[PDB]
Symmetry: C8
Subunit: 181 residues, 8 copies
């Protein structure tokens, strides 16, 4: 009697372990290259994750002519969330903090890759209120080739994001007088 | 009684997991080499995908004597769609944008590899209306050896596409006075 | 009752998946080396496939003292067709097109490896009517060692084909005054 | 009768071996880099683990301009505990001991990565009372980018921790007069 | 009823797939080294297979002090035939063709490795009538160490064959005045 | 009837082979580095194992400025014992023998890593009575960072042990006048 | 009824395939090094196998100060026979042939490794009558270290054989005036 | 009826194949390094095995300042015997033979590693009567660190053996005037 009820448990557990091995093996990541051609040194590298993590620290500071390379990724195991976060640096030469946001979803049926960058007044930690401002209020970019925008304070950026789910985000931060790389 | 009805579920799930592992493991890609011998610098690399994605960015710009190497691919998982997209660059020295299209289908029973290239007036992002113009209205080429065509504005291209489903697309963009590589 | 009818479906699907894995894993290819010792530059590399594909382009042109290396192969999956095709180049110094044909069958019970080469008047794309002329009307060669023939127009070729199903085709195109390599 | 009761034992043992293989294969570690820019030699490297172990010794001493690299990790087998510990060194030039704490949990539903550093009066071994002081009483830092704090005695540190579960902890110990690396 | 008749089909197919995997994995080959110390250039390399194939061409010609290296092999799949063939070259300096034969059977219960070499009058393709002459009428050698024989026309050969089923055949063709290598 | 009693034997043997494969694959070892900075040559390297073995010999002697590297390990197979042993050397320049002890248990529920070192009067082989003296009577050290102690006879040691179960033991033997490495 | 008779066929075929995979995977070989320090050139390398084969030829000749390296092996598949054979060379400077014999059995319950060497009058092929003379009539050596014997004609040999079943046979052939290597 | 009797045969054969795969995979070996610092050349390397074999020959001779490296091992397959043997060399400068014995058992419940060395009068082959003398009558050494003993005839040895079952045996043979390495 109950034997085939175990057979029903076996079919259920077989389907469930296949689900959890799929949600575990689905990989999402961003390579986040942010290149400082701005003429100003950046410091106090701060990070926030709405989703995901990174296995490495930011550089403490970024002098002129050097890049942040950062490798944020999806949480291990069957978590079903993408990579979504902010990185921010203080720029003491202008009294403002540069923040950069990326979103690399789990579910491309409802979401797509987005990125943004902006300056905020004073020294600020990266947190949820920068994520909300960069992702909803400050008009982020799609992962559909190169885009350029002013930051204010004599600075500018150009950047692009791959549209895949293992995405490269590249940003060059420049003075307004300079041609994008 | 219901036991063999589980046996029917097992035969169904066995056939379905084999289908999804086949549609997952079928690989489609284009290597898209576009070589700038045109005498003019290209900028603001823009991309559109009707199907597929790429794990890398375009170069921001392409100076004379250098090539775009770009590796667009099918979406991961059992998606059953090929690679189909446009890449476009602004050419400020002539006030026009060069666009390049490729199609590398999933289903070779109904489709084949196609490519095209053209100039459009002014700076334009790559999007669906360039895909429709390059794929239906502007007479694309089959993947059957080398073809050559004028762009207007003193420019020309020659290119070819492999007919496989892991295709190489090679295009040389030239001045009208030059012999194709 | 129907249980063993599933057992009959299991025996059928087991035999069928073994068939499709055999027809998938059977590999057919030609390495097609065509060496230009003719004293004339070749251009506008054109290709036709009756069966199979290649993952690479032809060279656009072939200057004197250089070779076309081309790697046509069977279609992936359980297709049960070999490699069969034409490659052709225009020779502007004589106003004719050199075409080369190879056939590397799936089914050696009914077919064998064949190759041929000829000049045609004017610039022509490779297509089915060159395949029919080279394979039926123009007396192709078996894969049984080296053969030599005149092209007309002061040119000659010598070539050979391996008889295997992963065949090397080597052709040297020469002036009539020259000893085959 | 009892046969299917063995079937119940088989379903139970199958679920349990999968649990123990998951809790075994879940990996937690900290790479603990502590860099001595303090102008003073450190000695008598001491360690405490609340959870986990390391496969290597501390350096006995750390001269000025050199770093402790230490690789503490989770206990092998299905232990279900993270990495949590203290490392401490005596600084004879000031008569105090520098301690550094990290926590890299097993269970991110209830815990997160934390770190701290402080000076204690006299030579002291690392033990549980330093763990309690550094983790509860002395206000530890989250793994959310770079932080800086004074130690007293003319010394300062800046450091950061990755938020992952295979975390990098980097600390630079500096004189109060110096800019963080 | 018919259920165990499927059981009989399963035992039959299990025994048959093991047979076909054995006949497929049994490997037979000859490495055929023929070294030209004869003082005369050889040309128009011709080949015949009674059994097997090769994945490479002969050299078109063999100048004095150089060797034919050729790698004939058994047909892929469960074919149950060995390697058996002739290679032949024209020697225009004497008006004769050198032929070399090897046999490397599938079935060592009924056959063994044999080889032979001879000169024939005029230019001739390798075919079945050379195989019959070299294997039955012209007294071939066993694979039992080095043998030497005159060709006529001032030429001689010494050679040996391994007796294995992955055999090396080595032949040195010499002038009658020379000591075998 | 007895059929399911075989089923009970199968469940028993399945659980037992999993136990013996776990107790076999659990690895315990010590890397035992003992560094001679003592100014005196050591000789007649002697060893005792209470548990475990080593696949290598001691050096016969250790001159000043050189180290014993020794790799004692758990016995292969499902033995359920750790590594526990003594190594000893005669020091003829002082008429005493240096012994070093380590313990690296199998069962960390009841035991932990311990080490010790001492001088004994005259030449003595390492045996069980040195193990008892070093492990119970002579106050061994825990694997919790660096420790230092006098040997008498003008000599001193500092050392540390990793607390893992694949432990590094490092000892520096020094003159009383010297600062520990 | 007949169902369990198939079960009896399954137990029989399972035991038989395990037997044939054991008799197939059991490897027997000899590395046969014969070193010519004799002052005389050897020629016309001849071989006989009572059991086994080799994948390589002998050298045609062996000049003074050079060695025959030869790698005879067991027949592939479940043959249940060892390696047993003779190699022989003509020595024209003395008008005699040196033969060397080795035996490397399959069945060490009834046999052991043996080797021998001798000179025979005139040029002779290696065959069964040399095997019988070297293995029964001419007192062969066991594989139990180095042995030395005179050949007559001013020559001597020393040699040894490993006693394993993947044996090295080393022989130095010397003049009677020389000390064995 | 007899069906479950086959089930009893399956449980028996399953337990037996696991036994034979364990007794096959258990590896026993000795690396036997014997170093000649004796001032006298050794010759005619002889070997005896009570258990095991070696895949290599001894050196024929050992000049002063060179070592015998020899790698005796357990017999392949499920033999359940260790490595036990003698190696011996003649020393013509003193008219005696040096023999060395090692024992590396299969069964450490009843046996342990032993070694010995001695000189015997005149040239003698290694055989069972040297094994009996070296293992029972001449007081062998345990594998418990370095030991030293006189040979007579102005010679001495020091040596050690690892206690594992993949043991290193190292022996230095010296003149009585020399300090052990
Ligand atoms: C009923 C109403 C349900 C509301 C349920 C509320 C919300 C859910 C999603 O947001 C989260 C996490 O999202 P994210 O990590 O991918 O970040 C990209 C999206 N933002 C950047 C935040 C804009 N799961 C997924 O997306 C993939 C789930 C898909 C799992 C499929 C199995
Ligand atoms: C209950 C059902 C379980 C649902 C859970 C989700 C299944 C996981 C299936 C494995 C999933 C996902 C990713 O690996 C890539 C997307 O990443 P990309 O980088 O390659 O490109 C993405 C960028 N674009 C989207 C193209 C714009 N696949 C998909 O999105 C479609 C998968 C969709 C899989 C097809 C559905 C199966 C049909 C039944
Ligand atoms: C009922 C009417 C059905 C109409 C259904 C409407 C259309 C479907 C196809 O277009 C899409 C995507 O196409 P593509 O990614 O391959 O791009 C090549 C084709 N264009 C470039 C667009 C011209 N699936 C496939 O092709 C492979 C499916 C094949 C999956 C087999 C399983
Ligand atoms: C429900 C049935 C499921 C149908 C889903 C589709 C099956 C996936 C089967 C695996 C599929 C596909 C690709 O890998 C290559 C094509 O790529 P290529 O680069 O090698 O050359 C293509 C270029 N040419 C076409 C030659 C012009 N195979 C095919 O097209 C034929 C597969 C066709 C497979 C044979 C059909 C099986 C017979 C039953
Ligand atoms: C009933 C009448 C049947 C007529 C059926 C009509 C014809 C069929 C064959 O031609 C095609 C493709 O041929 P090919 O790709 O190998 O090219 C070599 C032959 N030519 C170059 C064209 C001369 N399949 C095979 O050969 C292998 C099938 C064998 C598949 C075995 C499974
Ligand atoms: C329904 C049955 C399914 C039939 C489909 C076909 C079976 C695929 C079996 C796998 C097949 C094929 C190829 O790999 C090579 C041929 O290539 P080659 O390069 O090595 O030399 C070929 C050149 N010569 C022919 C020698 C002149 N095998 C064969 O031709 C014989 C296979 C023939 C296989 C033996 C038949 C099995 C016996 C029952
Ligand atoms: C009884 C049930 C057994 C429960 C035992 C636990 C299951 C083990 C499942 C395997 C587990 C864990 C780790 O590998 C990573 C976390 O490490 P990270 O470095 O990648 O990032 C962590 C840092 N943030 C958290 C993002 C802030 N996974 C998780 O935390 C979620 C797993 C959660 C797994 C999803 C739950 C399954 C659904 C049913
Ligand atoms: C229906 C039965 C199926 C029969 C088909 C044949 C079985 C294939 C079995 C696998 C077969 C074959 C080859 O690999 C080598 C021969 O090559 P070699 O280079 O190593 O030396 C050969 C040169 N000499 C012969 C020694 C002179 N084996 C054999 O000949 C004996 C195999 C004979 C296998 C032993 C018979 C099994 C006992 C029942
Ligand atoms: C009833 C009374 C039982 C008394 C039974 C008497 C004693 C037992 C243990 O000592 C032995 C060997 O110990 P050791 O090799 O780990 O060395 C560390 C301990 N000392 C250095 C000796 C202090 N087995 C284990 O530890 C692991 C067993 C654990 C196996 C788990 C399965
Ligand atoms: C009958 C039951 C069989 C019991 C036999 C024992 C099971 C073997 C399980 C595999 C075992 C062991 C070792 O590999 C490491 C310890 O070595 P370490 O170097 O990583 O750190 C150790 C140093 N500290 C202890 C942290 C101080 N695991 C453990 O100790 C906990 C295992 C404990 C395993 C969890 C228990 C399973 C739950 C049911
Ligand atoms: C019907 C039964 C089938 C019997 C067929 C034979 C079984 C094959 C078993 C696998 C066999 C064999 C060889 O690999 C090595 C011998 O080679 P060696 O180089 O390592 O040293 C050999 C030199 N000495 C002998 C030591 C002097 N094993 C043996 O001889 C004992 C095997 C004997 C295997 C133990 C018997 C199993 C117990 C039941
Ligand atoms: C019928 C039963 C079958 C019995 C056949 C024997 C089982 C084979 C089990 C695999 C066996 C053996 C060897 O690999 C190492 C010994 O070598 P070593 O170099 O690592 O150190 C040895 C030196 N000391 C001994 C420490 C002094 N294991 C053992 O001795 C204990 C195995 C003992 C295995 C534990 C017993 C299982 C419990 C039930």
């Amino acid at each position: 009697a109950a034997g085939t009820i175990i057979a029903g448990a076996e079919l259920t557990i077989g389907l469930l372990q296949n689900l959890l091995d799929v949600l575990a093996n689905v990989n999402r990541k961003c390579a986040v290259g942010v290149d400082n051609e701005s003429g100003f040194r950046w410091q106090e590298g701060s990070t926030y994750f709405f989703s995901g993590t990174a296995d490495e620290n930011l550089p403490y500071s970024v002098s002129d002519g050097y890049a942040v390379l950062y490798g944020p990724r999806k949480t291990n195991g069957p978590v079903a969330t993408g990579v979504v976060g902010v990185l921010a640096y203080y720029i003491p030469s202008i009294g403002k903090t540069l923040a950069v946001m990326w979103s690399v979803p789990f579910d491309y049926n409802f979401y797509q890759n987005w990125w943004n960058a902006k300056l905020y007044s004073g020294n600020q930690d990266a947190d949820y209120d920068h994520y909300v401002d960069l992702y909803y209020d400050a008009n982020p970019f799609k992962a559909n080739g190169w885009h350029e925008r002013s930051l204010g304070s004599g600075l500018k950026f150009c950047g692009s994001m791959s549209s895949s789910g293992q995405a490269t985000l590249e940003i060059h931060v420049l003075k307004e007088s300079e041609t994008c790389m």
